[PDB]
Structure 1
Amino acid sequence: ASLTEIEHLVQSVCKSYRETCQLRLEDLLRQRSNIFSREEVTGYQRKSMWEMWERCAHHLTEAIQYVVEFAKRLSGFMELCQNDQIVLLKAGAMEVVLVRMCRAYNADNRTVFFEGKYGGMELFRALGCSELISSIFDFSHSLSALHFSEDEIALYTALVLINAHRPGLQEKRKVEQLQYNLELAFHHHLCKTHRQSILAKLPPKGKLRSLCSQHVERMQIFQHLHPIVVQAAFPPLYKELFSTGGSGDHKIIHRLLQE
């Protein structure tokens, strides 16, 4: 691409993100003083493991659905073959969700927006996966220290998704070309806004991958303890992506990709 084309891709990506971001940043920021009470926190801590897992899976599924829509609107993604579309979303959708989540994280009091108010990580004690929760909060705290603009989140999450190293890609070169163009757009935008100093401070890829594998592991542990809960009350998209015995999702996401 030339320079006009790179800048055109920057605004295309930022638009696709804006149209698919699920929660508006201003809405999240206006709620920061709305903080769960002691009594409400205790109420969450008293819920059963399986009901809290069910609520979390519901919320992650909705977030993943917006990430699928982001991808469908992302320049060049629907021109990839359908095998590679699904490989990229299976490997990348949760990573994109985890990055988007820092927008709902308040670094000043270490709280997150959840079901109407902000609370700290003690809200989630009933899940019985505190080590994973702490890691997610720490990751979000590190991202918050970079002070991402919405445009930077757009460009960065596009690259999280368009990763030409994902195993299973059939047209590896076509994905490499898209990734390189999106890399130019990202770096051009940082150069133009004098923000290149964040590049060295972005998390290594191993970190996002560690969080998602831990998510699957804790999930599989919970499923082994409550198998019928996962079968009867978890969203089909989540079940197929992540659960033991899951089909793999190729069919729900293939049908989201067409609609």
Structure 2
Amino acid sequence: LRPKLSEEQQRIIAILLDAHHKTYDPTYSDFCQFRPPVRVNDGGGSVTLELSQLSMLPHLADLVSYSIQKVIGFAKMIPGFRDLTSEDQIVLLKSSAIEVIMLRSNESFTMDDMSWTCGNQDYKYRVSDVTKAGHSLELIEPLIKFQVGLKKLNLHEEEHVLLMAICIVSPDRPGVQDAALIEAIQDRLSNTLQTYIRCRHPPPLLYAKMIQKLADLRSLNEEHSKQYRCLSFQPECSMKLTPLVLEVFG
């Protein structure tokens, strides 16, 4: 059966597309405002050297902090999110921020050279730039794999914005109080996505592939948390981060 999208489901999709267009600048025009990227000579991928310099960390921490602000704005526009308590809104935002950043970065990700290309060569991020921010291959290589797997799903922007909304409104996040209300909001979004795929997505399992990405994101989130903890032990690291980043990942 291929039921048509209800008027409500159509409205949810319109709101989410509008929220994404207002919070995701595909020209990356604010990037000149971040602390500049610095690429030290590290052809050897030396952990000692990367931690000593953390040359890409101020730029990527500013990029991520800016992105977290955009994700907060997006989340606030998800139909039903404002019905949650302020406490549950913050729990969901803090636990999903890194996953939504990984999802939304797929728009700048390119399979041409396996990089996140945000305009000119200065704002092109490769595996080597992430190692220069203090992260290791145990996070970066599965993250690149995830990006390619997501790129190959060829999501319609409707499916992309619904996936990010479903990711944020997850009832199984530690510390959530009203799990039943969060689950009702998520089911409303999941049914919208399932209905959209069934009547708008041409041929040639897409919903199950999208739900598998959400599970992959949990593993990536856990690895990022372990790595962030290591990064945080580096003396003077806090100055290379931002107050928002420190709070979200602390």
Q: Quick one: distance in 2 between partners of 1:80 and 1:74?
A: 11
Q: Spell out the pairing of 1:96-245 with structure 2 (5 A cutoff).
A: 96-113=100-117, 116-117=120-121, 118=124, 120-126=126-132, 127-194=134-201, 197-202=205-210, 203-226=212-235, 228-230=236-238, 232-243=239-250
Matched, 1:85 2:89: yes
Seq. identity, %: 24
Q: Quick one: distance in 1 between partners of 2:136 and 2:87?
A: 33
Q: Quick one: distance in 2 between partners of 1:57 and 1:195?
A: 39
Q: Quick one: distance in 1 between partners of 2:130 and 2:98?
A: 19
Deviation at 1:3, TM superposition (A): 2.2
After superposition, give the CA deviation of every residue in 1:1-29 in whole Å (9 maximum; x if it has no partner): x92222222222222222212x31xx48x
| Runs of 5+ consecutive residues of structure 2 not aligned to the other structure | 29-37, 44-48
Give TM-score scaled by structure 1 length: 0.78
Deviation at 1:66, TM superposition (A): 0.2
Deviation at 1:115, TM superposition (A): 7.2
Q: Spell out the pairing of 1:23-62 with structure 2 (5 A cutoff).
A: 23-24=25-26, 27=27, 49-62=53-66
**Does the 8 A contact of 1:44 with 1:124 survive in 2?**
no
**1:115–1:106 CA distance, 2 compared to 1 (3 A):** closer
After superposition, give the CA deviation of every residue in 1:103-132 in whole Å (9 maximum; x if it has no partner): 111113212225732353234343351221
After superposition, give the CA deviation of every residue in 1:149-197 in whole Å (9 maximum; x if it has no partner): 2222111110001111223222222212111111111112112213584
1:11 corresponds to = 14
**Does the 8 A contact of 2:57 with 2:240 survive in 1?**
no
Q: Quick one: distance in 1 between partners of 2:213 and 2:115?
A: 24
Give TM-score scaled by structure 2 length: 0.80
| Runs of 5+ consecutive residues of structure 1 not aligned to the other structure | 29-39, 244-259
Larger deviation: 79-88 or 50-59?
Answer: 50-59
Q: Quick one: distance in 1 between partners of 2:141 and 2:191?
A: 34
Higher helix share: 1
Q: Quick one: distance in 2 between partners of 1:55 and 1:115?
A: 15
Number of equivalenced pairs: 226
1:248 corresponds to = none
* Local SS of the residue matching 1:78: helix
Q: Quick one: distance in 2 between partners of 1:195 and 1:168?
A: 39
Give the alignment's Cα RMSD to 1 decimal: 2.5
**1:81–1:113 CA distance, 2 compared to 1 (3 A):** same
Q: Quick one: distance in 2 between partners of 1:171 and 1:216?
A: 25
